Amino acid sequence: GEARLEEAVNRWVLKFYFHEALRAFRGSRYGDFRQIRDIMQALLVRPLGKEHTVSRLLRVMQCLSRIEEGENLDCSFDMEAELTPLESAINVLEMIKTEFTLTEAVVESSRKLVKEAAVIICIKNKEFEKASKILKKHMSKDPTTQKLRNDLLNIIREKNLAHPVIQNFSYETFQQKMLRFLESHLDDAEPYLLTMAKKALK
């Protein structure tokens, strides 16, 4: 009887902090995003009613969590093996790929940026063997990447961390592009507790 009413507010509390996380993520305020992430992670264990609306946002939160820590190779979300958080965002984007029922036309353009980021970040951290592994296992070998696909290995062979290709890559615009992509496939409905807090403090 009371289990649903707990599940009801649990969805509410979960969807409120998912909104504040994107809003903090959009403003490049990853400290509060990381704090809010831990709150949502603590809600994962709680009874959340099986609603497809929250499963979609949890996967979006999964991807953005791995991107925010994508420059920190001293941690791994898929801990069973050792996968850089950007390799982690690749598999999550592939789980977002199937469950969100997307045509690959809209997805593959974003999967370019993540696989590109997964290799470049490994280059800037001087783990050159790691970069080429992601480079062969995930990079497309299609024409659009063929210019950059050939560009990266040459740098990894030369250990040329000063190549413009590596230093023109800005991680901030990479995250923000991944945000509006993942966010465009969710609806901007205002969370119920945010509306209900607006009425009280007025």
Partner: peptide
């Protein structure tokens, strides 16, 4: 849903 939608990393 504890590692099903894992949001937090694990420091190596």
């Amino acid at each position: 849903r504890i590692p099903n939608y894992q949001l937090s990393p694990t420091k190596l």
